Amino acid sequence: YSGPKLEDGKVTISFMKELMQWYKDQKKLHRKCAYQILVQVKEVLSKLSTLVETTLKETEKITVCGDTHGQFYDLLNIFELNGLPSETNPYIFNGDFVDRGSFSVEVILTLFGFKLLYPDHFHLLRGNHETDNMNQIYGFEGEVKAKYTAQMYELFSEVFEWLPLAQCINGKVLIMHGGLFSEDGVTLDDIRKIERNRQPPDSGPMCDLLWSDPQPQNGRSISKRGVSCQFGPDVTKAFLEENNLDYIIRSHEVKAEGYEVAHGGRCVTVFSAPNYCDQMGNKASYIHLQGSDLRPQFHQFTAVPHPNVKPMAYANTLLQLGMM
Ligand SMILES: [Mn+2]
Ligand SMILES: [Mn+2]
């Protein structure tokens, strides 16, 4: 009731514009309204398939963004550079909305708000940082406990469990946060059937979708992250052949340029958090795909000013007082 207010218990574009300005000005969304957004978006997400399947007509486009990591001011910049989301300007945010960045609450509630507003044109896919083990140390849990209470965090966690794991555009481009699989023979049929409402297992398809990285050399390698695998071009090739796909778009890896094209064009990385952690000095990018041409078109962007709040401000003391 203090700050932005839902209209008859629903998100509206006026609410969303009010919310973005409220957040821009470093104000807090009332707990009752945050709660409502969370319960309503949980219901929406929990009805979706683990694999979202989207059809883009010849005249339509969609924007694909990678990690945002609580960089809310850079999120708003994406919308200034590329237009707000709507039925004619659809978006996919490819995981890792929270952690590291000190405005994670603002990014996620804005993202859930636009999911409730344009549920068929605003897509959210889970990342590895939409999980408990990462949130407990990399800032999101601490931020939510600081801005709300421990119990709100437990609700965010449960909502994240219902985020779909991948999205397929026109049966030709498959989008997931992390990547492909530690074993051969995984299909789109398998992905659709993943029981995703949980924390990811230590290994297996759900873990890979959120954790794997591409490597340049053929075959697989132990992951640099201690979970899932690195997968080479022949792994990517095999998977696309068996699933009649053209290529994959994934995120999960910081790139100095905000993107990378790997595996002879078959594995595209997109990363949407510029000057990551206020220190990487990287550019970010977003991609456009069109129904008449599903080749990715890259759009690079640089960081913009934000309030004087250091990254990892709500994180593990070990990470918090260890950079800047
Ligand atoms: Mn990630
Ligand atoms: Mn990330």
From Swiss-Prot:
Q: What is its main location?
A: nucleus
Chain spans, region Required for autoinhibition: 320-324
Catalytic activity entry:
O-phospho-L-seryl-[protein] + H2O = L-seryl-[protein] + phosphate; O-phospho-L-threonyl-[protein] + H2O = L-threonyl-[protein] + phosphate
| Enzyme active site | 129
GO terms of molecular function: ADP binding; ATP binding; G-protein alpha-subunit binding; Hsp70 protein binding; Hsp90 protein binding; identical protein binding; lipid binding; metal ion binding
Catalytic activity, EC: 3.1.3.16
Give the superkingdom in one word. Answer: Eukaryota
In which tissues has expression of this protein been reported? Ubiquitous.
Amino-acid biosynthesis among the record's keywords?
Answer: no
For this record, the Gene Ontology CC terms, alphabetical, are: cytosol; intracellular membrane-bounded organelle; nucleoplasm; nucleus; perikaryon; plasma membrane; protein folding chaperone complex; protein-containing complex
Please tell me where Mn(2+) 1 binds in this chain: 67, 69, 96
Query: What processing steps or modifications follow its translation?
Result: Activated by at least two different proteolytic cleavages producing a 56 kDa and a 50 kDa form.
What does UniProt list under activity regulation? Autoinhibited. In the autoinhibited state, the TPR domain interacts with the catalytic region and prevents substrate access to the catalytic pocket. Allosterically activated by various polyunsaturated fatty acids, free long-chain fatty-acids and long-chain fatty acyl-CoA esters, arachidonic acid being the most effective activator. HSP90A and probably RAC1, GNA12 and GNA13 can also release the autoinhibition by the TPR repeat. Activation by RAC1, GNA12 and GNA13 is synergistic with the one produced by fatty acids binding. Inhibited by okadaic acid.
What are the names of the required cofactors? Mg(2+); Mn(2+)
The record's top EC class is: hydrolase
For this chain's record, the cofactor binding note is: Binds 2 Mg(2+) or Mn(2+) cations per subunit.
The residues that the entry says bind Mn(2+) 2 are: 96, 128, 177, 252
**Where is it located?**
Nucleus; Cytoplasm; Cell membrane
Q: Subunit arrangement?
A: Probably forms a complex composed of chaperones HSP90 and HSP70, co-chaperones STIP1/HOP, CDC37, PPP5C, PTGES3/p23, TSC1 and client protein TSC2. Probably forms a complex composed of chaperones HSP90 and HSP70, co-chaperones CDC37, PPP5C, TSC1 and client protein TSC2, CDK4, AKT, RAF1 and NR3C1; this complex does not contain co-chaperones STIP1/HOP and PTGES3/p23. Part of a complex with HSP90/HSP90AA1 and steroid receptors. Interacts (via TPR repeats) with HSP90AA1 (via TPR repeat-binding motif) or HSPA1A/HSPA1B; the interaction is direct and activates the phosphatase activity.
This molecule's function is given as: Serine/threonine-protein phosphatase that dephosphorylates a myriad of proteins involved in different signaling pathways including the kinases CSNK1E, ASK1/MAP3K5, PRKDC and RAF1, the nuclear receptors NR3C1, PPARG, ESR1 and ESR2, SMAD proteins and TAU/MAPT. Implicated in wide ranging cellular processes, including apoptosis, differentiation, DNA damage response, cell survival, regulation of ion channels or circadian rhythms, in response to steroid and thyroid hormones, calcium, fatty acids, TGF-beta as well as oxidative and genotoxic stresses.
Q: What is this protein called?
A: Serine/threonine-protein phosphatase 5
Classification lineage? Eukaryota, Metazoa, Chordata, Craniata, Vertebrata
- Which residues of the parent protein does this chain contain? 176 to 499 of 499
